[PDB]
Paper text:
For our analyses, we refolded PspA in the presence of 50 nm sized small unilamellar EPL vesicles, similar to a recently described protocol. In the presence of EPL membranes, the rods had a wider diameter and a broader diameter distribution (200 to 345 Å) in comparison with the diameter values and distribution of the previously analyzed apo protein (180 to 290 Å). By segmenting the rods of the EPL-PspA sample and sorting the segments according to diameter through classification, we determined a total of 10 cryo-EM structures with resolutions ranging from 4.7 to 6.5 Å. While the imposed helical symmetry parameters suggested no architectural relationship between the PspA rods, helical lattice plots revealed that the left-handed helical rung corresponding to layer line ~110 Å in the power spectrum increased in Bessel order from n = 10, 11, 12…18 with increasing diameters of 200, 215, 235…345 Å, respectively. Upon insertion of an additional subunit into the helical rung, the assembly widens in discrete steps of around 20 Å up to a diameter of 345 Å. The rods with diameters larger than 280 Å were of particular interest as they showed enclosed double-layered lipid density in the cross-sectional top and side views in addition to the expected PspA protein densities, whereas rods of 270 Å diameter contained only partial lipid density and smaller diameters showed no density in the cross-section views. When comparing them with the previous apo structures, we observed that the structures of the EPL sample were identical to the apo structures with the same diameters, including their respective helical symmetry. The cryo-EM structures and MD simulations showed that only rods wider than 270 Å internalize and tubulate membranes. As indicated in the simulations, the energy required for membrane bending likely is too high for thinner rods to bend and internalize membrane tubules.
Author numbering:
A (entry chain 3), B (entry chain 2): 175 to 217
C (entry chain 0): 22 to 174
D (entry chain 1): 126 to 174
E (entry chain k): 28 to 125
Write the structure that this text describes.
Amino acid sequence: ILELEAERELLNPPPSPLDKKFEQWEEQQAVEATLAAMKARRS
Amino acid sequence: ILELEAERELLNPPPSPLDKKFEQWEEQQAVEATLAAMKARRS
Amino acid sequence: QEAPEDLLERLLGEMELELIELRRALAQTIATFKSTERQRDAQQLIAQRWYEKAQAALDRGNEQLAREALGQRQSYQSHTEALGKSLGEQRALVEQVRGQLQKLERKYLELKSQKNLYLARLKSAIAAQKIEEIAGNLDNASASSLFERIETK
Amino acid sequence: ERKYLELKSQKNLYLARLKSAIAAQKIEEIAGNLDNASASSLFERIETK
Amino acid sequence: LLERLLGEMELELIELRRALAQTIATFKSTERQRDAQQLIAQRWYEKAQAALDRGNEQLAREALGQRQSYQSHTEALGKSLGEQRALVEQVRGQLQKL
């Protein structure tokens, strides 16, 4: 079972900590940015 | 797919920038010349 | 070898089969191309619903759900952003084939147009040879093939 | 599932592109028989007769 | 033999015509492949731009540093495309007189 999963990730770009950081950060920016529009609109 | 398109253009004269220029220019002259008759007729 | 002229009619006879088959194919292309647009529209509409629910979540101070709702929308946002760009680029995909086909028909009609003209010219000549070929039998005595041989008898 | 649907999604798009080309070659291939006398494959040979 | 020789001659010429297309098929194929690579570098370059924003220059170093791998790969392929242009020119010059 384990070898084939590794084969998949080998043929995959395993999301690096950078893209995990970027995707999390941009999500953290996306949630904040989406939040930022709402927090400003309500006033 | 790509080879056969090239075969067509090989057996074709691919419109050169000159004929593109001429056809565009004569069109630019045709539109202007057709326009020129109208712009003069209206007065 | 076979008379290549006869094949000409057969070739165009089978030609229309391809052209009509082509015409069928192109529609299926735009069928899906526009289908994704509707599918995109539903997805973004769902995101709007999630976005709207986040707006409702924000109301009354329940911002906690809005984070999930907005956070949930991010999944479809990326899916929406992914598909939206695919739709934009697929536009040129259908443009070239449209540009491919539009020139297609104008040629065949003119190609078929001159087909018949030269068939007449050929059939014009096959008569000229035969009337002259038979006129060889009915000649001015240069060959004496048929008539003059009788005059001998 | 999210992959297969998109995988199946683009499956049909390029089939059309392929079937688009198979027509382009054939119309041009037959247009070779009906040419501008560069090859004289079919029509010009008749003009000889 | 003269008639036979030209009869088999057209076989080579048409076989030639097929061959030349496969040449430009790849020649232009690398250009698209180059375009994707540089586009990826642009994405990495763009992500570095995003990394720079908000003061997270640390990722930009990796992102820009990551782009250097494709930059060299991009620079390598770009020059190959440029020189391959003359490769297809001579054969085109070869065939046109043919």
